[PDB]
Amino acid sequence: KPHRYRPGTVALREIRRYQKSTELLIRKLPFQRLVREIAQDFKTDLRFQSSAVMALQEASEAYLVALFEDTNLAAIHAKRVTIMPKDIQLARRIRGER
Amino acid sequence: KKPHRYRPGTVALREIRRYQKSTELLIRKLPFQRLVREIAQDFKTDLRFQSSAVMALQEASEAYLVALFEDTNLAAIHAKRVTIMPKDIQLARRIRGE
Amino acid sequence: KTRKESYAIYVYKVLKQVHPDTGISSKAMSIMNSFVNDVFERIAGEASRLAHYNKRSTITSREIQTAVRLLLPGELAKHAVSEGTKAVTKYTS
Amino acid sequence: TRKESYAIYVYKVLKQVHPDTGISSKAMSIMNSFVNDVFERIAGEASRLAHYNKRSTITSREIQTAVRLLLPGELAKHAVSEGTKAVTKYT
Amino acid sequence: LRDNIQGITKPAIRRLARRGGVKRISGLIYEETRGVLKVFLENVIRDAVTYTEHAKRKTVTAMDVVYALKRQGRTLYGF
Amino acid sequence: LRDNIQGITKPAIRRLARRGGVKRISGLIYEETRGVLKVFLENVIRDAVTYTEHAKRKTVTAMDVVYALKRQGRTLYGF
Amino acid sequence: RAKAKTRSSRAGLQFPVGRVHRLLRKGNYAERVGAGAPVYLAAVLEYLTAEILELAGNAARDNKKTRIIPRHLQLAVRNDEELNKLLGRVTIAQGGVLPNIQSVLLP
Amino acid sequence: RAKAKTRSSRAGLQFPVGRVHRLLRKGNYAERVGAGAPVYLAAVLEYLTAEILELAGNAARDNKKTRIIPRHLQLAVRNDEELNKLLGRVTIAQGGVLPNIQSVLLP
DNA sequence: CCCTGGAGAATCCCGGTGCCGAGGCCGCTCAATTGGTCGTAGACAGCTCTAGCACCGCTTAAACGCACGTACGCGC
C-alpha cells in the first residue's frame, strides 16, 4: 500500500521549505517573456537587462507572497483554510489597490 | 394599541443613508480635544493646540476611522456576516500594514 | 499685512471659464488650494528626482512630462500631456 | 570611472561588532541600498523641514527632527543619543 | 487629565461606523476602535510634537498637523 | 508574443502561496493571481518605460525599475 | 522696456507661470529650472483644477446647489476613477464618503 | 596645510562625514548644510548599520553560518519590531519571509 | 403561510426670513515682467566595446493530466 500522505501534510512541508529557502520560485524565461509582451504595448523597440528582469521578478514575487499572506489571513478570518479569489479582492481593496 | 417596534437593522440602514450624505463632524469637539491634550501631555507638557489644529486632527481621524470601518464592514460580508467584530479590525490593520 | 501666497483667485478664473454660473465657498477654495499645492510638490519632487537620476542639473519641459506620466494614471495623464504640449508650443510661438 | 558606494565603511562597522562574521556581495548590495535609501528619506525630510519654517540651512537639529519622525520607538532615541555623542565629540 | 479615552462615546463610534456603511456594531468594537484611535492619535500628535519643537514653538499649529499626516501617506486637504 | 500570461504556471503560483503560508489553494486562485500579477506588472514596467524614455535609452535598466518601485512605496534592495 | 505681458496669456493659460517658476527655484529642487517647465506645470495644474471643478459643478447640479461646497469636491474626486487612484491616499476635510450600500445589506 | 585628519575620526565614527556632507550639497536639498548635519546623519546611519548587522550576525549564528547572506538580513529586519515598521514598505531581494505558520493550520 | 390594503413616522418638496459668508471694487506694492550678459549644462557627432538578442544541443527538473478519496466549502 502507498504511504498516502493526508491532504495538508505535504502542503505544510512546502510551507516550511519555501519560507527558509531564498530560491526564486517563478522561472526566469517564462517571467522574462511576460515582461516583454507587457512592455510591447508601451514600446515596440525596447530591451531589458538581465538584472532588470531579475529586479522585477523578486519584487513581483514578494508582492505576491505578501498578498498571499493577506489572502491566507482573510481565509481564517472567514472560517476557511482555502484561499479564494474574493479573498484576494478583499486584500486589494483593504490595501487600496483594488 | 401597538407600538411601532422597528426591527433591528432598518433604522441602522437609515442612519447610514442620513450620515453618508451628511457633512457635519460626528465626534464632538471638546471630548476629542481633551483626548488630544492628554495624549500630547505624555509626550510634552505645557503644550497648546490651535482650534483649527484640533479641527484638522478631528476630520483626519474620522476619515481614517471611517475608511477603516469600510474595510471592517467589507470583511464582514467576506466572512458571511453583517456584524463587525474586534478581530475584523485587527485583520484590517494587519492587511493595511498598521 | 503680509501677503500669503495662494491660488484662491486662479481657481476662480478656472471655474468661470468652465462653469460661469456657479460659485465656490472658502472651505472648498482652501481644499482646491491644498490640492494644487500638494500636486505641485509631487510633480516638482518627481522632476527633481528625475534630473538627479540622469545626473542633470536643470528641470526642463520633458522633466514635467515624465513626472505627470508617472503620477497621473491612464487617460488623465494623456490629456495632461496633450494640454502640457499645447501650452509649450503656444508659449514658444 | 569611479562609482560611489558604502561597501568598505559597513565592513569596518561589521568587524567592530562581530569580527568573526563576514558578508557577501548580494548582502553588500542590499546593505548599500539600505543606507542609500535611508539617506534620501532623512535628507528629504530635513529638506522639507527647512522649507516649512523658511530655513535656508540644514543643521544637526534638522537631521535630529527627521530621525524621530522616521524611526519609531526606542530606535529613534538611541539614534538621537548616538548623534548627540558624535556631535559633542566632533565639536 | 485622566480617563479622556472615554470621550469618544459609544454612539460617536456608532455614528462613525454608520458613515462607513456598517450594518451592525458589536459591543466589543467600541473598546477596540478607541484603542485604534488612541494608537493613531499617538503617532500623528507625536509627529506634530517634533514638528512644533523643531520650530521653537510651544503651540502646535494646524500646518504641522498637515505635515504629520502627509509624511505617512494620509495627506489632508483644507487644513 | 502571445499567451505569455500562462508562463506563470500552476506550481509556480502554488510555490508562491506556500511561501506565504497558504495551506489550501483553490482552482480559481491561479487565474485571479495571474490577473493581479498582470496589473502589478502593467504599472511598474510602464513606470520603468517612462523612466527609460526620459533617460534617452532604449534598454530598461534595473536602476530605472528601482525608482519605479520606490515611487509607489515598494523600494527594492539589492537591485 | 516693452509692455509687461504675462506668461500665462502668452501660453494661453490662467495659472501663473511666474509664480510656478519662482516656487520651483526657491523650493530647492534643482540648480536650474527650464523655460518650458513652469509652462508645462501650469497646464497640468490648470487641467486638473478644471476637471475637478467641472465634476464638482456637475455634483452641485445633481443636488441643485449653486455654491461649491467641500462635499461636492469629495464627491467629484471619488466618482472619477482617474481622480480616485490619483487621490487614493488623500483625505478631504468636510467631505464624507460615497453614499453606497452593499447588496446583501439592503432590506 | 596641516595633517589631514578625517572628520569621522574626530567624531569617533567609521562612516564618512565628508561624503555625507558632499551628497547633501549636490543632492538639491537646501541652500546651506550645517557642520553637524553630516556628523548626525552618519552617526544615525552607523547605528542603524551596526544594529542591523548585529541582528544579522545573531541570525547567522542561529543558522550555523559565519557569513552574512541576504536571508539573514531579511530575518534580522523583520524580527526586530522597529526595523519591521521602518522597512514595512521595503522589498528585500533573496530574503524570503519569516518561517511562521498559523495555529489552525497545524495538524 | 403569502398577498394586499390602510395608516404611523422619518424623509422630501416648498414658501418666507435674512445673514453672514461670498462676490465685487480700490489701492498699490511687492512679486511678476523686460532687456542684457556671460559660465555653463546640454544637444550633437564619432568610437567603441561590453552586454543583450537570436538560435542551437541536451538533459532534466519543472509542469500538464488523470485516478482516487477525505479535509473542507457550503447548504440548512
Residue numbers in the entry:
A (entry chain O): 37 to 134
B (entry chain S): 36 to 133
C (entry chain R): 28 to 120
D (entry chain V): 29 to 119
E (entry chain T), F (entry chain P): 22 to 100
G (entry chain Q), H (entry chain U): 11 to 117
What does the paper say about this structure?
In Saccharomyces cerevisiae, cryptic transcription at the coding region is prevented by the activity of Sin3 histone deacetylase (HDAC) complex Rpd3S, which is carried by the transcribing RNA polymerase II (RNAPII) to deacetylate and stabilize chromatin. The five-subunit Rpd3S complex contains a unique subunit Rco1, three core subunits (Rpd3, Sin3, and Ume1) that are shared between the 12-subunit Rpd3L complex, and an Eaf3 subunit that is also a component of the NuA4 histone acetyltransferase (HAT). Rpd3S utilizes the conserved Sin3 basic surface to bind to the nucleosomal DNA positions at SHL + 2, SHL + 5, and SHL + 7, under the conditions involving different H3K36me3–CHD interactions and DNA linker interactions.
3D classification of the Rpd3S–NCP187bp/MLA complex results in one overall conformation containing three classes, in which the Rpd3S broadly engages the NCP at the SHL + 2 position with slightly different local positionings. Further local refinement of Rpd3S and NCP density allowed us to obtain high-resolution maps of Rpd3S–NCP187bp/MLA complex with the Rpd3S complex at 2.8–3.1 Å and NCP at 2.6–2.7 Å resolution. We rationalize that the local differential positionings of Rpd3S were due to the absence of an acetylated histone substrate and that the plasticity allows the HDAC to sample H3/H4 histone tails with different modifications. We named the 3D classes of Rpd3S–NCP187bp/MLA at the SHL + 2 positions collectively as the H3/H4 deacetylation states of the Rpd3S–NCP complex, and we termed the K9Q-locked class as the H3K9 deacetylation state. This supports the hypothesis that Rpd3S can sample histone tails at the SHL + 2 position for deacetylation in the absence of the H3K9Q substrate mimic. In all H3/H4 and the locked H3K9 deacetylation states, Rpd3S binds to SHL + 2 of the NCP via a conserved Sin3 basic surface while the MRGA-PHDA arm binds to the phosphodiester backbone of the exiting DNA linker via Rco1A K320/K321/K328. Overall, our structures suggest that Rpd3S primarily targets H3/H4 histone tails through a concerted mechanism involving the coordinated bindings of the Sin3 basic surface to core nucleosomal DNA at SHL + 2, Eaf3 CHDs to H3K36MLA, and the MRGA-PHDA arm to the exit DNA linker.
